[PDB]
Design a protein around this ligand. Structure first.
Ligand SMILES: C[C@@H]1CCO[C@H]2Cn3cc(C(=O)NCc4ccc(F)cc4F)c(=O)c(O)c3C(=O)N12
Ligand SMILES: [Mg+2]
Ligand SMILES: [Mg+2]
Lengths: 264, 40, 52, 270, 40, 194, 142, 25
DNA sequence: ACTGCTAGAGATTTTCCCGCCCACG
DNA sequence: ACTGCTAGAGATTTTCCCGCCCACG
DNA sequence: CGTGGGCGGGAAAATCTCTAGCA
């Protein structure tokens, strides 16, 4: 348990795997894996600027009727909505619906007139959503958004005989693109990828919210065969018989009788 | 709960709370792994 | 989203993720293990000597 | 304070968040989170969760008017025993209810009446009748029918037995008298298995025999108890002894019905 | 119940179940002698 | 009398500026001598008056020793409100009991020391019989020694309030909203802890 | 600590000699700056200890100004029986808020007011100015 | 061989050798 | 100053009886 | 062949912490 | 003169229970 930390350290020196691999493989607590991936030099990539809130917005006018299409670009999930009239209130209503279903963090769109209303500004102020206009987050999926729109138009050309109304065939088409399109690495249709991304993001932000209070705390400690109260070290894992800390650069374990935790 | 899962089927689920071996039907079960796993 | 509590302090939006995540994890792990582990148990029942 | 507390306050301004959500999302103690929950006046909960207690005293009697087949029925219940009387009313008015209450007071030792705030129970005629008979009038919370819920349940039970007894009689009032006779005599169970007729006899007989006997006792026995109380050395007294215990006696000094151990006490004959 | 009576007034009655002193008010008392006393 | 009322004024001994102060509840002389007509010594004396007891206000005259930016900046930094008799008596009786110690001392401020103590501790009389330094303690330290409710009106779902308590009951509470003396059950109402 | 007992100490700062007086039972300081380190100024420090606040004795160090004949005559007609950590907390607060100080004395004033009424705590979020009056209240009401 | 994940935590080589062992028989 | 309450049904625990049989007189 | 259920408030039990002081190194 | 351990006082956290309302 405690003697696998150094062989995770040399593993991160040779191959630089992330905290999940060293946590699940070596059966470690994930805090020491995040500190191993933190203490490295060349493993310090960029920040957030990954994101589960990669959302593309695109309008189209099919059969003389407005269809507003949103894409969860981090997982490739895509849906749409038939809009009767081009105004900012309809876009704000659909944006608040998307915020109600999924945690929409950032939206990417163009500088269209319908998407630049102050009603959408008040809605995103009440929501707290970063907004982008014309700027792709990364230029790989930029054409893929349009190709998915053409794919959905091919699905519409499949299922226009499956329903009478436009929006009923639209809902059947997004149901088909949610489930009836397989492939990939492990046979995921469309929902398993996005629930995997959302679950991993929820778990890593729970780890961030857990660790953001521990770094405020202090652990004054002495050792066995020692009364010299060193510290204040940083807590990693509070245990019932052994507490894990780091004083300067070493992952140490201590008895709880030798420990003293400042509450702030 | 929370019991430990032992075997899953389609109509019933075998679990173990402390030492009992309970066979709970599928319409009574709740299976989840907490994000709070990072301590325990 | 904003209302927290219930089972483990989460909103319903997290539990609806966790339920389907366990759904598309555990039965796939079970399908992967049911083709490998196949043990045949003969049992002598109670009040009797028949190995069934 | 912290900036996260202020942003949780903005969260409370926009969504009226839970205390546990603000405590988890910003690493807060729960006391200030419950204070922020109690801060905005739009966050008002559903009150307390505990039921009150209705008095069980022999001098109290409940009344209620109920309705069945387009007719009004006066129901009276002794609260301590569950003895019930019922009658059909010609017309719902205070004078006929005053006549019914005068019959009740002439037949039974009634001191206190506790009804709801209906129109017929707030007339001047029942006020003059209760002043003539010396009856303490009391009413309840203006829109809480649960303090009268005993007699509401007895309106339920008597109508259920009326459902069993309606076929034997041609009219309502004969079946009403038959049903109230059935419930006051034939229905057996409750505390000691008896009907309420034996129970109210037991209540009135025990009341008389345990007030006159203690009245005859208290003029003879008169012991004055001085007591050195706890945490103190002052010998305080004298007090009236109610009953001598084995290691602790019960007394009343001025108004406090208290227990004093006999080692901390001192009993004087006069 | 049933506790033993110790003293009675009007406002409150004091009773004893096993060793306690219960100063029960008049609105909560129930003073009845069960007429199956003919055995006990 | 408020628990924090103090009064500041001035006296000129040989054209020499001292600042006297008195609590209105007791008539309690304290004083300081300043080298020149400045405001820094006035803020010095104000927060040294606060230096052992909490001070809520200071009463002054209508002079220009209280309309400057230094003293107002100090008093609004601390939080003491400013506003521009009971001092004019004891300021006249501050120059009288020096005579037992004036010629008996090289330095006159020693006679000021002994005279201000003989005014402080050895001055009693009247009802309570205490000293003035203990009278101010008695007054302020006897001055050193209430919830809201909300309710759901019956046959309605709307909650209202807040109201003030009148009498506690185990089933219902009587309250006043502004003048509405109403009794509401505890299952339909809820009291704030504070 | 009896509520009539107080304590004195001295310090030097920016070429100016300051003197602190504390109530030992509470811990609220009061400092004052004097121009010259003379016996007159510390006898006036005994005045601004004694003439308002309920003192009984004195407590200071072995300086020759603290035990002069002027101080002894002041204690003679002031009934004071001369017998015989208070500075570091003041030296912490003065340096953070030196910026609003045209003189050192105003910095001393705002620092002792920060010590007075901006640091709430104890058993009910109290001040030291309430604790001194509670202890001398117990003295005057016992 | 140093990067894993998925349902069973497979690499690419073990997955392709499992599908080749499936495809042979 | 006022206040939810009461009759009935399985259900479950607690407890005599009887017969009996296996252990003893 | 179908089925009552769920969010919040005191209240009560269970449990760390701290300081301290009395018992000990 | 220099340390340890139980206690108690207080915080605080997990559970019990119990109710309001959905027409
Ligand atoms: C027109 C359909 C056709 C079928 O019958 C009606 C009548 N009804 C009545 C309620 C109601 O009384 N809810 C409160 C409630 C009370 C007690 C309880 F145990 C559970 C409870 F939910 C409904 O909620 C509701 O949806 C209907 C409804 O839809 N319909
Ligand atoms: Mg009624
Ligand atoms: Mg009714």
């Amino acid at each position: 348990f405690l003697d696998g930390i150094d062989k995770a350290q040399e593993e991160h020196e040779k191959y630089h795997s992330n905290w999940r691999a060293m946590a699940s493989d070596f059966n470690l607590p994930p805090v020491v894996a995040k500190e191993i991936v933190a203490s490295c030099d060349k493993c310090q990539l960029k920040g957030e600027a990954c994101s589960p809130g990669i959302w593309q917005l695109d309008c189209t006018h099919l059969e003389g009727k407005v269809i507003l299409v949103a894409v969860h670009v981090a997982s490739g999930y895509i849906e749409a909505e038939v809009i009767p009239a081009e105004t900012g209130q309809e876009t704000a209503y659909f944006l608040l619906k998307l915020a109600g279903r999924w945690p929409v963090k950032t939206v990417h769109t163009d500088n269209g007139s319908n998407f630049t209303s102050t009603t959408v500004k008040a809605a995103c102020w009440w929501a707290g959503i970063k907004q982008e206009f014309g700027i792709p987050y990364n230029p790989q999926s930029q054409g893929v958004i349009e190709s998915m729109n053409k794919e959905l138009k091919k699905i519409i050309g499949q299922v226009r005989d499956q329903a009478e109304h436009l929006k009923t065939a639209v809902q059947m088409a997004v149901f088909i693109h949610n489930f009836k399109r397989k492939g990939g690495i492990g046979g995921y249709s469309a929902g398993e990828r996005i629930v995997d991304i959302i679950a991993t993001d929820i778990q890593t932000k729970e780890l961030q919210k857990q660790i953001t209070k521990i770094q405020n705390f202090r652990v004054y400690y002495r050792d066995s065969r020692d009364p010299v109260w060193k510290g204040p070290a940083k807590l990693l894992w509070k245990g019932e018989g052994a507490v894990v800390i780091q004083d300067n650069s070493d992952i140490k374990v201590v008895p709880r009788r030798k420990a003293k935790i400042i509450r702030d | 709960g929370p019991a430990k899962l032992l075997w899953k089927g389609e109509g019933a689920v075998v679990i173990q709370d402390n030492s009992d071996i309970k066979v709970v039907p599928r319409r009574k079960a709740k299976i989840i792994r907490d994000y709070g796993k990072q301590m325990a």
